[PDB]
């Protein structure tokens, strides 16, 4: 309607510029993104069709929304400015001083919106026909060199962000010298602060990864970055390092299938002790990796000796024999294992895409190294309570402090299990499934994940989950159909598998028809897990087949949480379609089992799943309230267990709430 | 005598420079005031040869470092030197304050607090060392009382004693760069609000500006309460004198404009201003507003986000 | 005639200006005697921000009046 209105009735509405923009301003202030869509499109069409004065008033209103409004308002107005500069740069070039006016308020804007603001300004500046209007081009160069020349970290952050995004947009022979000067100056001013240099490496890595830009500049920068990396950390593999250390410093965690009389080694611990530049190892390797992937089209034959190297480390592996000599050596050790795991995570991020089988064996050895150093680090944090290094309690360290893996690292997940007790191990699978669950939870209900769209992640997981985690599901059913710690691990892997299943199938882009084709292929994995041959079947037949496959896991389930996840998965599948008796019978079975404790919220959720789906709520309540009585008579624990003296409160609360409802 | 130190900082370190300090041993006051009088360039180059020549690993270098710091703090206050060489020597004192042990900085800070007690501070560039040292005291968590407790007693000695009336605003410019706790910013703003009475009026607005950039990292309610209550009291004095306008109304308008332009950069300050001057229950509105706070609100009405809330507050 | 200009660090500078001179002339005098760039300068008198195109006679600035100078650093 709005396109037809503003395309036909543009001469009539040209009177009422101010009323239209007042309505747009009143609509942008609210929630409900369908409203804010209309608030954006009103500005868009008003800029599209009206006169130059109304265009100036539109830009004024947008800068008013940015400089004043809240996060949704700033986001929407910046999206609108991006759409208008990509639509009409020549119209915005008349009003570009008003867009320059946002540089007064950089102390009020979030760093993501700083990225977006610098992007829109620097794509406005660097159109080819507007090189007669070079005033903005010199002015923003000036303000970047001004921002970078401050000692304060909050200004240096904005300077680094603006420098990287500006170099990225201007890098699509003298322009090569220009980006050379800019990158050299940001590298020179960002050299001294470690936190600034880390952010610089991260931003430059994100730029090289996300954007395809003019490979002559990449060819220029790669010879710089590779050489600075190979002289920065890489030393000779002589067994005695420099530095008077009170520690048996060795070259640990080699692969030992590589040639041990090689030159490439890593001077990590002497650099870390000479610090007290080693905190910038992982992002710099990410940068080098990305430059080589963009140059040689993913061929890492220049690097692939680097995952063979040991690391010059203290003998870490016992953290019990050196107990109660608590000192700064504990902080040294915990930060050492921290940097080791970050480096190993970046290696695993690097060489997961490669298809060579011995490289996959090396990456699996790196994963075993990751999980064993994770055990040593959690032991070190167990003995040393509060001395935590913040480098940009286990729940805190799990998500934010470590490096974030890619999505293609779960291409490891195609390899099968080798259970060590019955005869890719269990705990590395636990690690991978924990990571994938923690990603899907944040994405569908984490920086490099969020530049990928949720549709892209759901699309990519469909290949990357179902036909190789169904194998692990079958292996888990086989194991639990048949010493304590491996059971503890494999129970957690089973829980995480069902969690990832539920998080995938409960995705809220399946009401839309465009993703439903993907959903059909999803059912084509689940229906074809028992028997094939029935192809191009109706949707409800695939649903019945999938739930019939999913139902017979119920005897193998070793804990309450996996049962709850299974019933929520069955419910969120069966709602795509009588089945209330199925859900009720399953819930009743899981309420009736022994469960060798159980948190009250799990049992609350299972009881509200049971009572809403039964045939009669009233006779169900009368059933449980002729069981609530023989809990007192017989047991000093009932004939309907998980109804202890503790869990009576939860049973009562659910019964009262559900009777009232 | 300058040409026999430039050959000492060039070849090697500590083997020849450490004996030159103990052999001279007479005076470091006449040898720094008079070489600047002919050519000021020979002093900044001398400092990178004495300071590189006196590390903090040994004690006799540390005492010489304390001595050279004391005599260069005295000369930048005493001498009517050029602003260029002053900026250079303050720059070298900025670049060479990173690696100090505990007990020397507290004595240098004692000389600093002694200067804020009595001494004629014609240039506040001498107290520019006082920001950064309270940072480097805080990073040393070891008994010199730890660093933070010595920092607390230091700020207490600054706040408790009388503030030198000509340069009170200058000391307020020093707490902007130091990190403080909530109790520390609360103490420094209650001292800064206590010092409003014993001044001329027209230095109050930029000191208010020096408060607001401090108020961005601490308590804003105390600063706003003190400013509003103080100028409301002065308005009451002017009205009972009426029953003195052409400066008091001017300084009021200037302060209003300053804190509106500070609210323009810090919306948390604006939201706490709207909260503080709320009517709410009918008993607060018989003490809240004033002929100064109403003008302040009607100037806040210039800011686009605060147009609705402030006019709805004044209407109700 | 004589006026005072007080800045944020409490430094007070005496200016010899005629009321016929414009405001950017005063900013040029601050540039000469203090080195502060005129685009960063912002002048306040009696709670009024001075505009560039006016003079002292538009804002009723008489003898021994006090101006307030603040430094408007765009980004930092």
CSV table of N, CA and C in Angstrom, one decimal, chain A residues 554-636:
chain,number,residue,atom,x,y,z
A,554,UNK,N,13.1,-44.2,25.4
A,554,UNK,CA,12.6,-43.9,26.8
A,554,UNK,C,13.2,-44.8,27.8
A,555,UNK,N,13.5,-46.1,27.5
A,555,UNK,CA,14.0,-47.1,28.5
A,555,UNK,C,15.5,-46.8,28.8
A,556,UNK,N,16.2,-46.2,27.8
A,556,UNK,CA,17.7,-46.0,27.9
A,556,UNK,C,18.0,-44.7,28.6
A,557,UNK,N,17.0,-43.8,28.9
A,557,UNK,CA,17.3,-42.5,29.4
A,557,UNK,C,17.8,-42.6,30.9
A,558,UNK,N,18.9,-42.1,31.2
A,558,UNK,CA,19.5,-42.3,32.5
A,558,UNK,C,19.2,-41.2,33.6
A,559,UNK,N,18.6,-40.1,33.2
A,559,UNK,CA,18.3,-39.0,34.1
A,559,UNK,C,17.0,-38.3,33.8
A,560,UNK,N,16.6,-37.4,34.7
A,560,UNK,CA,15.3,-36.8,34.6
A,560,UNK,C,15.3,-35.7,33.4
A,561,UNK,N,16.4,-35.1,33.3
A,561,UNK,CA,16.5,-33.9,32.4
A,561,UNK,C,16.3,-34.3,30.9
A,562,UNK,N,16.9,-35.5,30.6
A,562,UNK,CA,16.9,-36.0,29.2
A,562,UNK,C,15.4,-36.5,28.9
A,563,UNK,N,14.7,-37.0,29.9
A,563,UNK,CA,13.3,-37.4,29.8
A,563,UNK,C,12.5,-36.1,29.5
A,564,UNK,N,12.7,-35.1,30.2
A,564,UNK,CA,11.9,-33.8,30.0
A,564,UNK,C,12.2,-33.3,28.6
A,565,UNK,N,13.5,-33.3,28.2
A,565,UNK,CA,13.9,-32.8,26.9
A,565,UNK,C,13.2,-33.6,25.8
A,566,UNK,N,13.2,-34.9,26.0
A,566,UNK,CA,12.6,-35.9,25.0
A,566,UNK,C,11.1,-35.6,24.9
A,567,UNK,N,10.4,-35.3,26.0
A,567,UNK,CA,8.9,-35.0,25.9
A,567,UNK,C,8.7,-33.6,25.3
A,568,UNK,N,9.6,-32.7,25.6
A,568,UNK,CA,9.4,-31.3,24.9
A,568,UNK,C,9.7,-31.5,23.4
A,569,UNK,N,10.6,-32.3,23.0
A,569,UNK,CA,11.0,-32.5,21.6
A,569,UNK,C,9.8,-33.2,20.9
A,570,UNK,N,9.2,-34.2,21.5
A,570,UNK,CA,8.0,-34.9,21.0
A,570,UNK,C,6.8,-34.0,20.8
A,571,UNK,N,6.7,-33.1,21.8
A,571,UNK,CA,5.5,-32.1,21.8
A,571,UNK,C,5.7,-31.1,20.7
A,572,UNK,N,6.9,-30.6,20.5
A,572,UNK,CA,7.2,-29.5,19.5
A,572,UNK,C,7.3,-30.1,18.1
A,573,UNK,N,7.5,-31.4,18.0
A,573,UNK,CA,7.3,-32.1,16.7
A,573,UNK,C,5.8,-32.4,16.4
A,574,UNK,N,5.1,-33.0,17.4
A,574,UNK,CA,3.7,-33.4,17.2
A,574,UNK,C,2.8,-32.2,17.0
A,575,UNK,N,3.1,-31.0,17.5
A,575,UNK,CA,2.3,-29.8,17.3
A,575,UNK,C,2.3,-29.4,15.8
A,576,UNK,N,3.2,-29.9,14.9
A,576,UNK,CA,3.1,-29.7,13.5
A,576,UNK,C,1.9,-30.4,12.8
A,577,UNK,N,1.4,-31.4,13.5
A,577,UNK,CA,0.2,-32.1,13.0
A,577,UNK,C,-1.0,-31.2,13.1
A,578,UNK,N,-5.7,-37.2,20.5
A,578,UNK,CA,-5.2,-38.4,19.8
A,578,UNK,C,-3.8,-38.7,20.2
A,579,UNK,N,-2.9,-37.7,20.2
A,579,UNK,CA,-1.5,-37.8,20.6
A,579,UNK,C,-1.4,-37.3,22.0
A,580,UNK,N,-2.4,-36.7,22.6
A,580,UNK,CA,-2.4,-36.3,24.0
A,580,UNK,C,-2.2,-37.5,24.9
A,581,UNK,N,-2.9,-38.6,24.6
A,581,UNK,CA,-2.7,-39.9,25.4
A,581,UNK,C,-1.2,-40.3,25.3
A,582,UNK,N,-0.6,-40.2,24.1
A,582,UNK,CA,0.8,-40.5,24.0
A,582,UNK,C,1.7,-39.7,24.9
A,583,UNK,N,1.5,-38.4,24.9
A,583,UNK,CA,2.3,-37.5,25.7
A,583,UNK,C,2.0,-37.7,27.2
A,584,UNK,N,0.8,-38.0,27.5
A,584,UNK,CA,0.3,-38.2,28.9
A,584,UNK,C,0.9,-39.5,29.4
A,585,UNK,N,0.8,-40.6,28.6
A,585,UNK,CA,1.3,-41.9,29.0
A,585,UNK,C,2.8,-41.9,29.2
A,586,UNK,N,3.5,-41.1,28.3
A,586,UNK,CA,5.0,-41.0,28.5
A,586,UNK,C,5.3,-40.2,29.7
A,587,UNK,N,4.6,-39.1,30.0
A,587,UNK,CA,4.9,-38.3,31.2
A,587,UNK,C,4.6,-39.1,32.4
A,588,UNK,N,3.5,-39.9,32.4
A,588,UNK,CA,3.1,-40.7,33.5
A,588,UNK,C,4.2,-41.8,33.8
A,589,UNK,N,4.7,-42.4,32.7
A,589,UNK,CA,5.8,-43.4,32.8
A,589,UNK,C,7.0,-42.8,33.5
A,590,UNK,N,7.4,-41.6,33.1
A,590,UNK,CA,8.6,-40.9,33.6
A,590,UNK,C,8.3,-40.3,35.0
A,591,UNK,N,7.0,-40.1,35.4
A,591,UNK,CA,6.7,-39.7,36.8
A,591,UNK,C,6.7,-41.0,37.7
A,592,UNK,N,6.5,-42.2,37.1
A,592,UNK,CA,6.4,-43.4,37.8
A,592,UNK,C,7.7,-44.2,38.0
A,593,UNK,N,8.7,-43.8,37.3
A,593,UNK,CA,10.0,-44.5,37.4
A,593,UNK,C,10.7,-44.1,38.7
A,594,UNK,N,11.9,-44.8,39.0
A,594,UNK,CA,12.6,-44.7,40.3
A,594,UNK,C,13.6,-43.5,40.3
A,595,UNK,N,14.3,-43.3,39.2
A,595,UNK,CA,15.3,-42.1,39.1
A,595,UNK,C,16.4,-42.2,40.2
A,596,UNK,N,17.4,-43.0,40.1
A,596,UNK,CA,18.4,-43.1,41.1
A,596,UNK,C,19.3,-41.9,41.1
A,597,UNK,N,20.2,-35.6,42.9
A,597,UNK,CA,18.7,-35.8,42.9
A,597,UNK,C,18.0,-35.1,41.7
A,598,UNK,N,16.7,-34.8,41.8
A,598,UNK,CA,15.9,-34.1,40.8
A,598,UNK,C,15.5,-32.7,41.3
A,599,UNK,N,15.9,-31.7,40.5
A,599,UNK,CA,15.5,-30.3,40.9
A,599,UNK,C,14.0,-30.1,40.7
A,600,UNK,N,13.4,-29.2,41.4
A,600,UNK,CA,12.0,-29.0,41.5
A,600,UNK,C,11.4,-28.4,40.2
A,601,UNK,N,12.2,-27.7,39.4
A,601,UNK,CA,11.8,-27.0,38.2
A,601,UNK,C,11.6,-28.0,37.1
A,602,UNK,N,12.5,-29.0,37.0
A,602,UNK,CA,12.4,-30.1,36.0
A,602,UNK,C,11.0,-30.8,36.3
A,603,UNK,N,10.7,-31.1,37.5
A,603,UNK,CA,9.6,-31.9,37.9
A,603,UNK,C,8.3,-31.1,37.7
A,604,UNK,N,8.4,-29.8,38.0
A,604,UNK,CA,7.3,-28.9,37.8
A,604,UNK,C,6.9,-28.9,36.3
A,605,UNK,N,7.9,-28.8,35.4
A,605,UNK,CA,7.7,-28.7,34.0
A,605,UNK,C,7.1,-30.0,33.5
A,606,UNK,N,7.6,-31.1,34.0
A,606,UNK,CA,7.0,-32.5,33.6
A,606,UNK,C,5.6,-32.6,34.1
A,607,UNK,N,5.3,-32.1,35.3
A,607,UNK,CA,3.9,-32.2,35.8
A,607,UNK,C,2.9,-31.4,35.0
A,608,UNK,N,3.3,-30.1,34.7
A,608,UNK,CA,2.4,-29.3,33.8
A,608,UNK,C,2.4,-29.8,32.4
A,609,UNK,N,3.3,-30.6,32.0
A,609,UNK,CA,3.2,-31.4,30.7
A,609,UNK,C,2.2,-32.5,30.8
A,610,UNK,N,2.2,-33.2,31.9
A,610,UNK,CA,1.3,-34.4,32.2
A,610,UNK,C,-0.1,-33.9,32.3
A,611,UNK,N,-0.4,-32.9,33.2
A,611,UNK,CA,-1.7,-32.6,33.6
A,611,UNK,C,-2.5,-31.9,32.5
A,612,UNK,N,-1.8,-31.1,31.7
A,612,UNK,CA,-2.6,-30.4,30.6
A,612,UNK,C,-3.0,-31.4,29.5
A,613,UNK,N,-2.2,-32.5,29.3
A,613,UNK,CA,-2.4,-33.5,28.2
A,613,UNK,C,-3.2,-34.7,28.6
A,614,UNK,N,-3.6,-34.9,29.8
A,614,UNK,CA,-4.4,-36.1,30.2
A,614,UNK,C,-5.8,-35.9,29.7
A,615,UNK,N,-6.6,-37.0,29.7
A,615,UNK,CA,-8.0,-37.0,29.2
A,615,UNK,C,-8.9,-36.2,30.2
A,616,UNK,N,-8.7,-36.3,31.5
A,616,UNK,CA,-9.5,-35.6,32.5
A,616,UNK,C,-8.6,-35.1,33.6
A,617,UNK,N,-8.6,-33.8,33.8
A,617,UNK,CA,-7.7,-33.2,34.8
A,617,UNK,C,-8.2,-33.5,36.2
A,618,UNK,N,-9.5,-33.6,36.4
A,618,UNK,CA,-10.2,-33.7,37.7
A,618,UNK,C,-9.9,-35.1,38.3
A,619,UNK,N,-10.1,-36.1,37.4
A,619,UNK,CA,-9.9,-37.5,37.9
A,619,UNK,C,-8.4,-37.8,38.1
A,620,UNK,N,-7.6,-37.1,37.3
A,620,UNK,CA,-6.1,-37.1,37.5
A,620,UNK,C,-5.7,-36.5,38.9
A,621,UNK,N,-6.3,-35.4,39.2
A,621,UNK,CA,-6.0,-34.7,40.5
A,621,UNK,C,-6.6,-35.6,41.7
A,622,UNK,N,-7.7,-36.3,41.5
A,622,UNK,CA,-8.3,-37.2,42.5
A,622,UNK,C,-7.4,-38.4,42.6
A,623,UNK,N,-6.7,-38.8,41.5
A,623,UNK,CA,-5.8,-40.0,41.5
A,623,UNK,C,-4.6,-39.6,42.4
A,624,UNK,N,-4.0,-38.5,42.1
A,624,UNK,CA,-2.8,-38.0,42.9
A,624,UNK,C,-3.1,-37.7,44.3
A,625,UNK,N,-4.3,-37.3,44.6
A,625,UNK,CA,-4.8,-36.9,46.0
A,625,UNK,C,-5.4,-38.1,46.7
A,626,UNK,N,-5.4,-39.3,46.1
A,626,UNK,CA,-5.5,-40.7,46.8
A,626,UNK,C,-4.2,-41.4,46.9
A,627,UNK,N,-3.1,-40.7,46.6
A,627,UNK,CA,-1.7,-41.1,46.6
A,627,UNK,C,-1.0,-40.2,47.6
A,628,UNK,N,-1.3,-38.9,47.6
A,628,UNK,CA,-0.8,-37.9,48.6
A,628,UNK,C,-1.1,-38.4,50.1
A,629,UNK,N,-2.1,-39.2,50.3
A,629,UNK,CA,-2.5,-39.7,51.6
A,629,UNK,C,-1.7,-40.9,52.0
A,630,UNK,N,-1.5,-42.0,51.3
A,630,UNK,CA,-0.6,-43.1,51.7
A,630,UNK,C,0.9,-42.8,51.7
A,631,UNK,N,1.3,-41.5,51.4
A,631,UNK,CA,2.7,-41.1,51.6
A,631,UNK,C,2.9,-40.9,53.1
A,632,UNK,N,1.9,-40.6,53.9
A,632,UNK,CA,2.0,-40.4,55.4
A,632,UNK,C,1.9,-41.8,56.1
A,633,UNK,N,1.0,-42.6,55.6
A,633,UNK,CA,0.7,-43.9,56.3
A,633,UNK,C,1.8,-44.8,56.2
A,634,UNK,N,2.3,-45.1,55.0
A,634,UNK,CA,3.3,-46.2,54.8
A,634,UNK,C,4.7,-45.7,55.0
A,635,UNK,N,5.1,-44.7,54.1
A,635,UNK,CA,6.6,-44.3,54.1
A,635,UNK,C,6.8,-43.4,55.3
A,636,UNK,N,7.8,-43.6,56.2
A,636,UNK,CA,8.2,-42.7,57.2
A,636,UNK,C,9.1,-41.6,56.7
